[PDB]
Structure formats: structure tokens, C-alpha cells
Amino acid sequence: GSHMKAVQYTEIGSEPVVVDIPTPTPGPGEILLKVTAAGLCHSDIFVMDMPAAQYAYGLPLTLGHEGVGTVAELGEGVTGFGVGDAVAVYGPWGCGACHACARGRENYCTRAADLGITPPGLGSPGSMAEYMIVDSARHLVPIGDLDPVAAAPLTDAGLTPYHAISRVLPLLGPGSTAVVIGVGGLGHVGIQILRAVSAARVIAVDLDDDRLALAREVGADAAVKSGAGAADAIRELTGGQGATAVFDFVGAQSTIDTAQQVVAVDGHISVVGIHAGAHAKVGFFMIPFGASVVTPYWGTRSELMEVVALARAGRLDIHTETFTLDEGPAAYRRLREGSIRGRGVVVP
Amino acid sequence: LVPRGSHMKAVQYTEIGSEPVVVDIPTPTPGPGEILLKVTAAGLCHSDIFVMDMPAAQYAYGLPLTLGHEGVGTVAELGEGVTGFGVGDAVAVYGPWGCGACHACARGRENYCTRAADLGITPPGLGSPGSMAEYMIVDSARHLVPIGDLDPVAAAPLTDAGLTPYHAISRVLPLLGPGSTAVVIGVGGLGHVGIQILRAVSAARVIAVDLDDDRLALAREVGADAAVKSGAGAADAIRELTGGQGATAVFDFVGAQSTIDTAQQVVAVDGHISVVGIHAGAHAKVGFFMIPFGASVVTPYWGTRSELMEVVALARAGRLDIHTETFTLDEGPAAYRRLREGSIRGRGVVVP
Amino acid sequence: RGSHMKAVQYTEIGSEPVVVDIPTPTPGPGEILLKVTAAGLCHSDIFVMDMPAAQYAYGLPLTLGHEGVGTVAELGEGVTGFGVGDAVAVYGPWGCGACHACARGRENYCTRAADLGITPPGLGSPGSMAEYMIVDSARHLVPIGDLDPVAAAPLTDAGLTPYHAISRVLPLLGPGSTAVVIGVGGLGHVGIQILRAVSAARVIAVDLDDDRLALAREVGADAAVKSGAGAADAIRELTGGQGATAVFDFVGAQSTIDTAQQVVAVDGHISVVGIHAGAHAKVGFFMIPFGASVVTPYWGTRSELMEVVALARAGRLDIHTETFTLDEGPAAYRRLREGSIRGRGVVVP
Amino acid sequence: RGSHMKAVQYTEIGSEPVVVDIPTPTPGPGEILLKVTAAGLCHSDIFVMDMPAAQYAYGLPLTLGHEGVGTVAELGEGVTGFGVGDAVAVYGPWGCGACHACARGRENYCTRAADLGITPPGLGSPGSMAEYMIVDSARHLVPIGDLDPVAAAPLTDAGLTPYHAISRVLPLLGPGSTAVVIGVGGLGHVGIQILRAVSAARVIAVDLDDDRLALAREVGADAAVKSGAGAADAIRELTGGQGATAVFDFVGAQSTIDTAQQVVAVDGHISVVGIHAGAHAKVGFFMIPFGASVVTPYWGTRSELMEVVALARAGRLDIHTETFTLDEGPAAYRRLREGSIRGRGVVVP
């Protein structure tokens, strides 16, 4: 096919539309994938709600940074995969040559911004299209016979909480407690990860009893309703010792405040969710001694392989709702109104 | 609506600036050479809105005016001397009446009659009584085209929604061979038919341009090879699909200055731009280094009689799928309100 | 044949052309070397040399002359179809020869020439204003037989360009049709001759001078009226109010384009042939009659140039010429700028 | 490359084609050497090889193959426009390139080719049924991109020839028109697909074989009629009493031409594309409807070949092919002679 359907963000303030664009051809070192599943996440809405001044990803933009597909054509000199191999796309592309990239932590590449290296669906053409280009073979991770619909969320919904947990995993030994705030998209996977790679007790925190009920099924040992009573409730569940780690996937100021009120001495707060302006206040007597705080970014490539390994072993169960490519824009309206059970996935 | 006597219901423009109204007016009787039709379907056109929005100083079609220049019906009464049609024959109304005697008319191109203006010959619904009524007069048998057993609702838009794009395409059809690209701007009442015509009478690649995801999907449904969003990025998106070579012909059914601007930015050397949609003041700028060499531009008008016959032949062969919404005569004014807000999917059609 | 040759070149922006001594070119494979017998002057050369430093994109130094006629001097490797001594005219608007437009015989509308940097002689490539010139391919040579080269040089542009413009709508110009010619200078004077030879259309001329109107009548215009605000009414006066089938605007000013839009007939045509930067037709509803198409044509096709040469060889095309030597080249361009050349200037090396 | 190559040649009148070794050609200036990727064969080759020895004057030996496709292997001196590796189809009816017909983009109707001895490859010049082939000029190569060469080879004749015949009267084939196709095995099979792609004409297929008529319906024929004395009555029955706008007779027998004259419409057209020696239409008053033109078209133009390639690459043209190796060339011609090839045989060296 000389052209292909793609869900694109074409102008500021408008809804994404299904438009026809040229089918890309892989240059030297590139790989062309036939997309088999493309995930939607709230970060797409956040990007699409940016005003004209702040948005810096160029228009038009093919959406979709949660991509999985099969190798369709290999660019010149690309060995490592064969036509038909099922692969997941590593999102946070880096330069590959800086100290951070050499350590595997391409998500923390120190030259990507200066060089204009952007992830697919966030500056580079995304996965919500019949075909997509991947810049390099090192940004492809094999998935074997993993169902592509289940695999697509793993590239962000799985990778991002996995990285946040991995940053302080040595603290989550037996006897530790991990608090998960927001047990929807990412927190649901975070709970499953915590139970798989650690023996820590998991406390779920969310506004909706519906979300709390599911959190208990996937391993959460206790559930608390979000609000002004959450802090007291969490400490009541842990005596007065606090939570070794708090993974806030909401990112609102109120949830960060709850995290700072319950984190243990020498603990950790991970601000994963994004609410513009929300921030933790790290100062003496405003947070326990030794309790570190960070805003993590996506994850490393080796962590993506580990997330795939968890899924192939039956340890990650991602709730998905499938959509057609033509249903792409409709799916984003569904995501906007919070009417999607778990994760939305477009199957071209 | 069961026929009931010497008066008929009609949708009329009666005073400047007001909405049209349904009225019970006398049923006309055909004079010698004329034909009385029982109307079976009357289509709504955006040009009706343009006419009804003209100020008193500009409007020159007389009041009251029975609206509707998109008419099909059945022969009800033959005027004196009229042979060639029998009572009951299903016919489509050729709209752009001409004098029939000038050089243009002698070639069938009555839409370009050079004497109609001087003689006061005006089309039904645009100066003469239109088809949005139970009955209508047609001036001459040569302005009737048989439609056979075609469904009236689907046949009525053929007289303008089909005929007008068909004529614009026909003007440069020899340019639209295999390997050519035809750009269609607008997938409304006319554009969604133009796409189908291009697929049926040419091997050109068809790229549609519109705003709504619904319109772009409609374009693909009716046969467009590709569809892109209108606006500032439309020109680049088209040239991406053409490999930067430019479009052989651009058919602009919107006619806004921005869409004409896009047409000039994508038209190929020696190509064509057809400005079909009407926006007052909007115009192409045909000058050196403002448009590619040899790229011609025209504002076409309706179509020829032989073209209308060819449009009916396309419909009877199953090559035209006209999207319609049906209204009653009493709903006529409400239908025009729907047309104003652009909530009519395809073409609105009144069925007496 | 000497190793050096005389030529006239545009050498630096904003300055006048100068006479120079440059190496005589040698034809590579596929090319043909001509001994120039006449090189025509054209106002388009002034337009090119008036481009500011930034806007000019035709390269320096540039041997001028895009109206070239000569005799075959040396055949490049593999070139047949012409023999040494054959008198040929140089087809100007070189194309790639391989795109759909080129394959249809419309090289002037080649869709690849710009991308490939293919430019006409004298407008990017070495022109004809020199003792010798290189032609890239044999398909850009047209035989002229024993036709006087001074007469043939203007045919390559002054004849080909109006001929193409008329040819685009010739089927409209049957008996009873009317063709309006605005401007009876170089191209319009030839345009009238063409219209009389290939059609039975009534020709009405429009110009600004009593002398120009009288010239128009002499070359076959049935009527002539003065240009200006009253021009449109004056034409409609002669046509009985019917409007003109086609309008060929060889001036191209905004005022003449405006006139053309006021006189063109329903389902007619307007050809904007003259070049005035910024002037353009306004093609929209209520600003132009229904069905009246408008185009800016470009030069002409190769088969059209053959037909122009056939008209001239049959005694149906005459173009007033003034002759200059190569040394008088820059002088002739001074004359061209100040509009003091009657007809077309031709340089004879 | 090796100093010699295999070629399927017609070396003696009345003989069968044989695989012989001949020197590998080298491209002179302006020429292109192709490595052949596909060489189609058709009944025109059998007709040529059936010419009696009494009519033979010159031409032997002849490398067969006028339906050639290949990749550029070596560029002659001065040739630009293609690079080594480019996939190209060979335009068959070579012309002089300088006459009016050639300049108009109708080299198939070149008026100088016969006098100059310019013959098509495989029909007077070395054909494509060999490891390598010479093309005289770059303008006789048409790029095909990534189109399968085996699918491209038949289109150089089985596609181009019906496309040209239809194109000659395409403006007549509007909605409401009827096109009759006599002989739907090869050229007519592609002609049916062309008619459905470039027009809205109703297509009536006429043939002797019931299986070929079923295939005709599958590729766009609206009706099927048994060829014979009753075909004219059956065709009229299908069109009322109106007749067919155009009749494309790919058989060319006297009986089929007679049927064409009995069904063509007033002001219609009859295209005699197939060849049967001595068969002809009788164009005279009351022997054919008024205004119905008759012609024997020849092959097609280069721009038409580009359009045929465009149709094929868009998935709108399909002909069944059976591939043979170059060593099997004679076997392919044996199969063709006994009429057991479905679609088109293609030789792949």
C-alpha cells in the first residue's frame, strides 16, 4: 500500500482525526513495522491539551507511544530481526552514545533533547497507524507469541511503574510496605509488579470503590479511599511506622501531600502521575529524614525486557478494551471521560 | 400527501430576509409546449441559502418564489402539441434553461446560453417556480430527461448534486488518465457525488479534503483513495501523498478563499482548478508566479443536457450512491434550517 | 574553428551585459554544436537581469539568448538525424524528456525540469548570443530549411508563445467566434497573423496608440479600439453586447486583465501571456462569467514550433526585425530596456 | 558479463526458433544495455514466423521478443536519466523522434521510421528474448518501479495495444455507451479491464469459447455473446435497437468484422486490432452506419505505455502468465502455437 491510515494530531485544540498519509519506507538502520496494537494513555490527552506556546512536537503528529507490531521490512544493514518477528517498541529513544545510554538508561539520555531525538507519538511518528518506523534495532524488544493487545500496554503502562519500583526495589523486602495511590491504568500494573518482584505489603489508595475492588484482586493486601482520611487510615494499617515507599500514579498535590504524610523515615516517594504544578516539598521537618523523592521517566530497555518476561510468565494481567483504527479518535473521547476499563488499545 | 384538487402546497421565499413558508397556491396548468409534472422528489441546495441571504438590492428572482431547482417527477398533464412523453413517465428536470437557439444551446450547452439573461429565461426555483411543491411546470420537453424506475429520492440530487460535479469533471476529463491525481475539496452534497463520478469515468487517484472525521470517512466510503484534513496543513498533506508532484486537477466544492488557496498550492503544472463552491468574494489569483504554468482555472456552472443524461445512466448502472435525508413538504422550512447549520448528512430531499 | 569565441554575458547582478571572449565549446556525446546565425532579443531578458541579488537563480556568468538559430557545426558522439550545415532552430523550454508531460509532447510543461535543474538556453544554460552554442539533445533542434535565420529567430519565442496560447483553445475559435488581442507589439502582432491563418475567428485588437491600432488593422484585425477604462464597452459595442470567445492579453497588466474579464464571453477563455509582476486574473463567482477559463501559458511545445516554422515557410508569418552585431549586443539591450526597438531585435554573429 | 549470450532466434524461413549463442552486445553512444528480466511472447511472433519465404528480403537472423522488460546494466556514452539497476519496460514501436508525429508523442505513427529502417525490437531489431538487449535511446525505456517484471512484459503489447485502440475514441465511451469486445482471450481480456478502469461504458464480450466468456464476465464484462452468425442479433437484443458505440475487434477475421459493422451505432467506431490477412471492413454508404469511423490502430504511444504501467501498479490490470526459462523459449513458442497457453507466456532469462 502506497498510503496508510493514521490517527494524527493536526492542529492545536482539535481532536485527532483518521487521515491518509504515505506509507513510510525504512532507511538504512531503520525497521518498518506492521502495527498490531497501539495503546492510548492519558499522556496523549495531556500533550493534546497543551496550548500553542508549550507544544513542541510538530504538526501533524501521528499519535501512539505504546506500540507493538511485526517486522515488515528491514532497512539497509539491519540484522537482528527477521520479517514477521513480533516486537514491542521501546519508547524513550536516546542518542545511544552518552554515559547514560551506555549504561542502558536511554530514558535518561543527556543528549536526546539537544539532538531532537523524540519518542514515537511524542515528536516522532507514533504507532497508531497501519505501519510505523523504528529508528534503530536496539529500540525493538521481542515478545514471542505474546498477544499484541496485551503487549502494547506493557511498553508504558507496564514499563513506567516497573521503572519507578525498580529505582528502590532493594528497600521493598519482607516487612516493608508499599503504598500505591491511583490503582487505575498504571497503578493496577504497579500492584501486580510489586507482588511479583517483591514481598512487600501493598496498600491500595483510590477515590473509587470500583477501582479499589480490582486492586484487591491483583494482590493489594488493603484498600483505602483517597482523601483527607487516607493518611490516618494508612498509618493505622501500619501502626505508626509509615510506608517504606509511596508510588503516586495520580500526581495531584493532594496525593503527594498524602504520600509525604505516610512515607517512612529513609523511605521513598515516586511521583509518577503528572498534574501540572503539583510538587513534593522536600525540606527539613516537611518530610521524614532520608525519604527521597523523584519524578521518574518511563523506563530502561532492560526493564522493558523484564516487563515482557513477567507478562509471558503470567504475572501481569492488563485489562484492555480493543478499538479499530477508525475508532481511534472515538477511543480518545472515551479516555477523556474516564470511561475506559483499564487500557485502550487500537488494533489496525 | 394525497393529491386533493386545484391548489397545491409549495415552499416559497416570500419576503426578503425571512424564512420560506409553506403555502397553498393554485395548481398551474401547462400551456402549449409545456409539461405539468407531479413532483416526486425535490432536493435542497446550499445555493438556496445563498439566494435567500441576498439583500433586497441584489436579489433579482422575484417574490414569491417557489424554491427548488433539484426536481424529479412524473408527467401529469401534457401541454398542447407535446409528444415524446406520456402521462406517468418518470423524468428529471434539466435546470439551467436556455433559449435553445444560440450557438451554445445548439451544442446542448444550454447552461452557457448567451441569450437567457437578455430574454429573462431563468431556472425553476431560481427565478421560475421550482420543484418544492406537489406540481411544477416545465417550459419545454427538451428540459425533461427520463429516469425510468429510479427511486425519486435518490434521483432528485442527480439534477444538480450530480450534474454540477459531473460537468466540472467533464471539462478536463482527458487530463484524468491513469497516473493522474484529482483532489476533491469538500465531501458535502456535491463533493461526495463528485468522488464517485471520478471513480466511474476516470482512473485518476482521488484525494478528498474536509474537516470532520465523519466527512473524511464518508469520502473513503464513497471511493476516495485517500482523505486528509482541510486547513493550513492540507496542501502539505496532499503533496505528501503525491510525492510532491502536485495534483492534476483540484475540484473545490467549498469555494472559500482558504480552499482556493490550497488548490493553487497543490495544482500541477498544466493542471486545472475548478471553483465550484460559492463564497462571495473568494477568487483564485491567476498570474505569473502565483499559479503554476498552464494550470487553468474556471468557475463552472451546472451542466449540459447530455451530461445530465450521462449522470442518470451512471445512477441506473449502480455507480452512484447518493446519501439523502427525506423531508415532507411541511418540513421544508425546517429542512432549510438543518441545511444552514450543516446537520444534513448528504443531500436533503423533500418528498411531496 | 578558433579555440576562443565571442559572446555576450550577464556577469554580475544589477549590471549590464558585456561582450567577452570565452572558450569555444565542444559537443559531448548526444550534444550538438551550432554556429549561431541569429540570436533574438526579448524583454524577458530584461526581467531576468532585473532580479535582485536574492531572487536571481539562473547562475553567473550567463551567456544570454533563448531565441537561437544556427547551422550544425559539429555532431557529438552518437548524434544522427542532422548533418553538418543543416539550418535548425533551437527549441527553448528544455525538459527531461521522460515524464508524462514530456512523453505527450509538452516539454514546456515538464514536471521534472526544475527538480533536475534543466533550464532553457540563455535562461540558466549557455544561450545563443555567441559565435557558437551547445544544444543538449537533437530533439531540441527543429529544421528551418532555407528560411532566413534573422526571420526564424523570433519564431522560437515571439511566434511559439502566442501560437501555443491560441492553440490551447483553438477548437473554440470557429466561424462566428470573436478573439480579442490586447497589445499589438511583438507577440500580439504575431498572434493576429496566427489567428487569421489557423481560424476564421473575428479578431478585435486593443492597444494604446493610433499607430498600433492602424498596425492591427493592417495585419488582419477586423476592428481595433483603444485600451483603457472604455476598452471593455468599446469591444462589446462592436460585438453587439455578446462578449468575446477568447481574450489573448499580451500586455498582462492588471488593467488589461480587468478589461479581459469584462469582455470575455460565457464559456470563453482568457490567456494571460504578457508578464507584469503582481498582475493576476481574479477567478471567482460574479467576478468572471460562468465557464470562462483563465490560464498563464508558458512558451510552447516542440510540434507547435514545427507548425510555426511551417507557417513562416508558407509566407504567413512576418516579424519586424532589427539586426545587431555581437559587439552591439549590450547596445541592443540598452535599446530594449528603453523600448526603442521596433519589432524584435536579432543579433547576428 | 560474458563475451557471448544465449538468444532465441528465428534463423531460417519456415523453421522453428532456436536457442543460439551470440556475442553479448555493448551499448554505443546514446544506447542502453539491459539485463533482460522478462520477455513476453504472443501470436504476432507466430504471424511473423509464418511469412512465406517468397516474401522474404532481409532480416535474418532475428532475436525474437517485442515485449521486453529488464534492468539497466550499462549506459552508453552520454545517456542520462537512468541509473544501473533501474527496472524499465521497453517501448516497442521505435520511431525517428524528429517528425511531427514523433514530436506529438505518437512514435507508433512515425512517418520516417520505414524510410530510415527503424524497426521494433523483436520485429526487425534485436529483441528481448535473450540474456541482454540493446535499446536505441533512453526515450524507449519506461520505468516500472517495483512492478513484477513478469507482469510488466505482457503490458508492453497486450496492455498497450488495446489501451491505444480504446484511447482513440475514449471520449465516446461515456455513461450510457456500449463497447463490444470480440475476442476476449488475450488483448481483449486486458481491453475489458481497461474499459472498466477508464470509462463507464457497458462492456459486451463476444467469443467462440464459453470458458473465455466466463472469464470475461469475471473481469468486468456485463454480458457475454457466442461468436458466430447469431452474435449480431444477440448483441442488438442486448442493446435494444440502438447498437454499440464502439466495437473493438481483437480477432480481425472477416466474419468478426462483418459482425462489427452490423452492430456498430450511428456515429460509432470500429477498431480492427486483430490481424487476419486480407480481412477488412467495407466502409461505404449503406454498408456501414453513418458517421461510424473504422481504423486499424498500431500498438500505442509512449505516454499510453506509462498509463498502462500506472494501471498495472494500481492493481487494475491483471493477465495470467506462465513463465519459461530462456533455454525453454522454443518450448514456450511450441505451447503458444498449439494454443495451450492461458493468458501470456513470459520468458525469464
Ligand SMILES: CC(C)(C)[Si](C)(C)OCCC[n+]1cccc(C(N)=O)c1
Ligand atoms: C514524560 C512526559 C512529561 C513527556 Si508524559 C507524563 C506527558 O508521558 C510520556 C511517557 C508516558 N508516561 C505516562 C505516565 C507516566 C510517565 C512517567 N512518570 O514518566 C510517563
Ligand SMILES: CC(C)(C)[Si](C)(C)OCCC[n+]1cccc(C(N)=O)c1
Ligand atoms: C520573463 C518570464 C519570467 C515571465 Si518567462 C521565464 C515565462 O519568459 C521566458 C519564456 C519566453 N516567454 C516570453 C514571454 C512570455 C512567455 C509566456 N507567457 O509563455 C514566454
Ligand SMILES: CC(C)(C)[Si](C)(C)OCCC[n+]1cccc(C(N)=O)c1
Ligand atoms: C507484425 C504484425 C503484423 C503481426 Si502486428 C503490427 C499486428 O504486431 C505488432 C506487435 C504488437 N501488436 C500485436 C497485436 C496487434 C497489434 C496492432 N493492432 O497494432 C500490435
Ligand code: NA
Ligand atoms: Na483546505
Ligand code: NA
Ligand atoms: Na462474431
Ligand SMILES: [Zn+2]
Ligand atoms: Zn502511555
Ligand SMILES: [Zn+2]
Ligand atoms: Zn544518550
Ligand SMILES: [Zn+2]
Ligand atoms: Zn444548486
Ligand SMILES: [Zn+2]
Ligand atoms: Zn441559448
Ligand SMILES: [Zn+2]
Ligand atoms: Zn524571448
Ligand SMILES: [Zn+2]
Ligand atoms: Zn519532463
Ligand SMILES: [Zn+2]
Ligand atoms: Zn506481443
Ligand SMILES: [Zn+2]
Ligand atoms: Zn518520427
